Symmetry: C5
Subunit: 310 residues, 5 copies
């Protein structure tokens, strides 16, 4: 029984983050726990305060026509507790619920793990005898609470795209709204735990350039190589399978290349020194001592530029 109107019905929306948590990169989901607040004109609910007795009268959801607001990018239907309903004299309805949902928003891993992300919560509503369009009351958005934390990330800002994408679907009109939680990853821990160990075992690997022991050099380069495969696996598992190339995915691959050519070099210099050609062998190795670090640093300049430098 929507409010009988001479005009299209605006439902005012606002979301107060109380808790957000469980950002799942493999799933590309996160879990949020918040207030949802709705506001609208139902003049059928208009009462005269003085004669009816009181400043606001309160119903239970069963009593009133309430718009069916739905989350678009949500997995299973939301859980909500209706915290309050209030009608002001002129028929102004104040709805307040507390919900929790895991919403599904895609992620961009190209600058992983130095990425920043923008999570979206989309509210849609579907019209009937009066049409519904939604819009945002920014004072009842108040952002998040000041204890709101998302483990492993920095919350940059929580705002809403002020007013909606209105479109046709299955013969009726729908109005969609976009609330946006921007986060930046805390990359710190990747450094002592992933990047630096990788670097170390790579450097250890080419330590085989001030050596002339084939019988040992093979041992070195393949040891370090194994450890790097372990790191590749460790990293790969806690990420989704992306159709594009990431920054540390790039680094990791580039490293496999350095290991392969290192192996090649090692092999060549040994073949040479058994072909009674120690001059040319030793000069290849001395080249490598300069080549490998320099071409590495260069490749990394190019690479970092290619990812972040645009």
């Amino acid at each position: 029984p929507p409010p009988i109107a001479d005009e299209p019905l605006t439902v005012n929306t606002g979301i107060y983050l109380i808790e957000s948590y469980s950002l799942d990169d493999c799933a590309e989901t996160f879990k949020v726990n918040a207030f949802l607040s709705l506001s609208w004109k139902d003049r059928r609910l208009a009462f005269d305060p003085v004669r009816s007795g009181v400043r606001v009268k309160t119903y239970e959801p069963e009593a009133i026509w309430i718009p069916e607001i739905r989350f678009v990018n949500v997995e299973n239907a939301r859980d909500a507790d209706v915290v309050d309903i209030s009608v002001s004299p002129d028929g102004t309805v104040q709805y307040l619920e507390r919900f929790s949902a895991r919403v599904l928003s895609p992620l961009d891993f190209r600058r992983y793990p130095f990425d920043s992300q923008t999570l979206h919560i989309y509210l849609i509503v579907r019209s009937v005898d009066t049409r519904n369009i939604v819009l945002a009351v920014d004072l009842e958005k108040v952002g998040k609470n000041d204890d709101v934390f998302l483990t492993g990330w920095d919350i940059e800002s929580f705002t809403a795209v002020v007013k909606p994408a209105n479109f046709a679907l299955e013969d009726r009109l729908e109005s969609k709204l976009d609330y946006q939680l921007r986060i930046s990853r805390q990359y710190f821990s990747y450094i002592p735990n992933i990047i630096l160990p990788m670097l170390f075992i790579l450097f250890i690997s080419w330590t085989a350039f001030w050596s002339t022991s084939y019988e040992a050099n093979v041992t070195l380069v393949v040891s370090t190589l194994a450890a790097h495969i372990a790191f590749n696996i460790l990293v790969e598992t806690c990420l989704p399978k992306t159709p594009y190339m990431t920054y540390t995915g790039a680094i990791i691959f580039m490293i496999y290349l350095f290991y392969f050519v290192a192996v090649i070099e090692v092999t060549v210099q040994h073949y040479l020194k058994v072909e009674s050609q120690p001059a040319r062998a030793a000069s290849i190795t001395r080249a490598s001592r300069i080549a490998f670090p320099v071409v590495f640093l260069l490749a990394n300049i190019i690479l970092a530029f290619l990812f972040f430098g645009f």
Copy 2:
């Protein structure tokens, strides 16, 4: 309370993908979030002047006879929210709910990870005093909304098989409808993370063909074998146990054969060269230097043709 039955009751169906997600290859399941739309006329509901109050009015599920539509290949009963019910002047009812389900559809892994799949959602309806058959209205199907993504996959098409399978079951006849979501896997990340590294360690394996140090050659070939075993494990765990052979299963197995014969050879050349036959030893190893890559490349040609080329 079935509808006055002058005819077999047609229920018009449609599914609108809002979200699909969590394709589980070990499970052969995926999760869908969609509009389900049902429509039929119940002439008992027919009132048809705009009289005495409204053009079309809305009842709630408990007031009306609703065909009980069920998904065949789902795990638990679906979780559904009824979005609206509208009854038309001759009692033409349009039912709209929003559900989420994890649907269970088999997958074909033979051309993994270059496989494509066609997921199924099967709807049955079951009869009584009149017979029910289902069918599809394509406006209320239109597939996905074009924001639908399934991580790690490209969504090709969402269609429905227009004609139902109407068949006998126990007491009464049932009507089944087949909606089909075709997807193709995004193989990109498999190359830098699995195939290329696999290849590299196989090649480093063959580097022992330009060496005569048994004591180190063994080190080489068993090391690389180890990393292959690790890769075999990594890949194999995250797939189900298929009764058939997959493409990268074929590849991985072939690679085992190459490692085993490599080892055999290494052993042979050291045994010969301690059995005082360095001519024949050096000729067998040098032979292998050409042999192994070529038998590898053509074996892969045979294999690729054997899989994709048919």
Copy 3:
């Protein structure tokens, strides 16, 4: 209000498999999704169609006395949606529901992974003013559906055991029924992924019998040993801890023994060869080249017979 009869009430049962899936060997559980069909006579519900108006009438569960059937070997109570209730003129009630549950049935791992299993679904009912016995109607126990698949398994047959187990419980008598779905495992994928790799790494181990290189033979034997531990762990984790010995458990163990006496031999031939006794060492070694394959093939014949051969 149970049906007042003369003496003991037969409630006719039938189960139609719709989906079965998620066999968990560590849990020894699996998930089933099926029709449950019940039938019994309540002569109080008997109506004659001439005066009552219709050929058969249908109630809702609260309208009728319905026997409460329960599954014995189930984790949490199955949850079901009732498809229909029909009473025949003579008071014959035909009940039909659709349930899904994970039923808990034990497994025999002695011939893993070449095992076959017999899954059970047990139905219980509890009596009062009339005695209840359950029995099976085979015509609407039309078995299973032909799209029914259980991943990694072949479904051999689905039938039910015709006479119930009637016994005293909590001082009233209960009636129990046994439906049993026999499956046989699909071992195919175990061969290229576990067994053949196991064998290979074992043979590569025995390559140390054509080497006089301790310095390397040690490398060979502990390397392969390690890979065999990785395979052991891999196989072992996806199994429960059985109080008995499994077939591949036996194999894996025997393999450990082979690795140990191999190490021993290597140790011995090196000590002999430095103890200035190359004669007995080399003859011990040539012995081993013959012994190890032969005692392996023998032990495996013995074992294969010991398990499968009785």
Copy 4:
């Protein structure tokens, strides 16, 4: 509306284990599926059979005052099926439900994996206006079904502590009952999968006592040590973090000590034998050949006695 009493109300309890399963050593939880039987006199319910149709009449839960009995050491409130309620003429009520709960009882891991455990189910009832005390009818306590099995454990006995702990809580008194399910771990599988391999690689380690090859002795001892760390990890993951010391925890730690002094010996004999001091070196090694197994066997007797022998 409790039965108005001239005395404290005894509610008679009994629990019938139908299924038990999912013992979690990390969580220290397990899952149970059982009958709960309650009984009390509500003299207000007293009816005499002479008046009405039947000797005992049956109600449904909403009609009657039913005591709220709760499991104390359970995670979330149990979910139950009320199977039957019968009031006998003297107003004697027999209540029967079938529940499933995962109950939380601590475990003692000191003799792992040769420990036995005592699982608990605690029932409380909280009085009001009259006193409620719980007590046990052993005739209605089953112990278990004759098919009740708990994977990886031997179920010894299910009994109950007959007199309750009745105590003050938040100003009213509660009555607690303690049911005790005794189990013994089935350790068989630990021997072929964990204990014996672990020992073997320890022995293989000690092969370096018959070697005099530093490069190979080192190869040996670090290889074996690697596998022992892998085993330590393997075991450690499936146990919780106890403030005390477990048995295989002790053994495993001891083994680490053996590997360390082993390495020390190896390094020492190499150093002596390069200090042109083969006398001292070879005599230390010959010593170790006897020393290591003996100090091991002793350490292990002292250990076992220290654990099980008290």
Copy 5:
């Protein structure tokens, strides 16, 4: 419809811990099972005992107005079981429910695993026709049960912060209450499973200082480095990614540094000694023999002071 008020309604609170469990460090959550006790005056409930029959009357939650108390840092709405409601003649209501929830509270990992934590449970209530303030009755908060155990942790205390935080939210005010469960972790098992083995393989690593065998020293240092990579991984995974530096993270990283400088050194001493400079090389290792343990112990004093010494 709160009790008509002349002034702010105080709702008196209390929490009795029955079970707490599943402390998750990656999630930074834990699970609790407790009594929640609420008490307030609603004078509309005032009764004459004599005329009405009973000194205290008990309702069920629907009959009465009950204040909506909600938990702030919880994931989903708690699951609650309402155990009692008792009203006193003067309209004083005693509410008692048994709830279970996983509450989300942040953790400080800087002194891991020698950290202590203060877990929080925050209760809020929100106002309407009258305002609610919550407050704590310390007796109905009679601490914890002394069978309350938290695996892997020692429970220090359970208390409540006596004064509420009363603040404005969304145009009406809320009253927040802070209960604090202080725990300290049980570090015992970290010593035999992580710290000592790490130390052992680091020492085993430094045995390469009494060895001029490059060909083996590489073997030593990189094998131990490998196992230490495994320890880093093991430890790291069971912790969340903190933006800051932890204590054992600090240690593990320092250890990587020691490995790198070790490799550097063995590499240089070998390079020197094949570069025909045996005096100074041997003096570099003789130095290292003292240097590495002493700089290690010194760095550890500085680090431990840096963490715990504040």
